[model samples]
Target: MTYTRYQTLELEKEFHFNRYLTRRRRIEIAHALSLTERQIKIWFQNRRMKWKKENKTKGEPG
Candidate 1:
């Protein structure tokens, strides 16, 4: 199952909102996207890592 960059961004946005102020399990995100729970989990981890890298490059200083 291949996903376009835009689709991944959309999923990231939705996941952020759904998981805000609370922990959303992979199953919930997967159900929303009709994907496997593992995929959702991996996407979130990757997205978060990307965000951290971007912030670091920006010299946000933590």
Candidate 2:
């Protein structure tokens, strides 16, 4: 499904904050984004892995 720009921004913000705040379940994020719980869970999983890869490449003892 397609998301509006506002919805996209909201999802990103929620994901960013959630990573730092208490651990939020998919249902919680879904509630925040007005999306399905499964969508939130998948988004989090993919974003987490993507950030993990990006972070691993930073601050190396080069």
Candidate 3:
């Protein structure tokens, strides 16, 4: 299942400020977002990957 717009938007806001989340923070966000810790972990992982793709430097040597 996918997250709601509100959840995605809230997570995006956090991503803008902190690409990382500590254990405690993750649990807190999990409760606040009504999601599981594992979900939050995966969310951050995928989001960071997306961020890398979006911000990758151009014209890099192979």
Candidate 4:
């Protein structure tokens, strides 16, 4: 299922604050988004990966 702009916007804010997830926080996010905990888990994984790829700028030393 595709998320609407509003839904993703909310998730984006949380991702900016903290990229990691806890059990309670996942449940809380699910309740707010009206999605399953699994969905939130998967979303965070995908979002984190996306950010990592974007963060890798050329010529940046490790």
Candidate 5:
């Protein structure tokens, strides 16, 4: 995982929510990314954490 690069260039485009993904939609994103739901889940959790680390602006509104 290029980590930030994937999120910066790809995943974030596909998922523009601040948080919350219904299981079905999460699975769809997983397939779209060729990833498991677990990976998607972790990516989102981490991205949300990134927002906290900055402690400034939030992610694009949910």
Candidate 6:
């Protein structure tokens, strides 16, 4: 079976604020948060795309 775990708001908040997830840091967050690196990667990607679509900049989650 395959499943995708949801990223918690807290976790997303941290990464969202960071605005830059270096490969090494990406791995580190995945380990600390019990999420896969790709999960972290994709969440950041999606959030950035959403933010760009909805507003002016990466000016924090409103």
TM-score of each: 0.58, 0.56, 0.78, 0.79, 0.62, 0.59
| Angstrom error at residue 3, model 3 | 0.6
What lDDT tens digits, residue by residue, belong to model 5 across residues 1-62?
A: 35556545556765565367679988887776667688778877777777566655563443
Candidate 4, 1-62: lDDT as tens digits: 69867768878887998888899988888788888889888999999778766777762563
**Per model, how many backbone clashes are there?**
0, 0, 0, 0, 0, 0
Candidate 2 regions with alpha-carbon error over 4 angstroms: 20-25, 53-62
lDDT of 1 by residue, 1-62 (tens): 68766657768677567643124555565665677667676776677777677766575786
lDDT of 4: 0.83
For all predictions, the C-alpha RMSD in Å is 3.5, 3.9, 2.7, 2.2, 4.7, 5.1
Candidate 1, poorest ten consecutive residues by summed lDDT: 19-28
- Compared with the true structure, model 2 gives a TM-score of 0.56
By the lDDT metric, which is better: model 3 or model 5? 3
Better of 1 and 2 by lDDT: 2
Put down candidate 3 lDDT per residue, 1-62, tens digits, no spaces.
78988888878887887879999988888887889889888999999778766765662331
lDDT of each: 0.65, 0.66, 0.83, 0.83, 0.68, 0.70
TM-score of 1: 0.58
Winner of 1 and 5 under lDDT: 5
The collision pairs in model 6 are: none
**The candidate that achieves the highest TM-score relative to the unseen native structure:** 4
Q: Per-residue alpha-carbon lDDT of model 2 for 1-62, expressed as tens digits?
A: 68667767876787777763234565665676687666666766677777666666573543
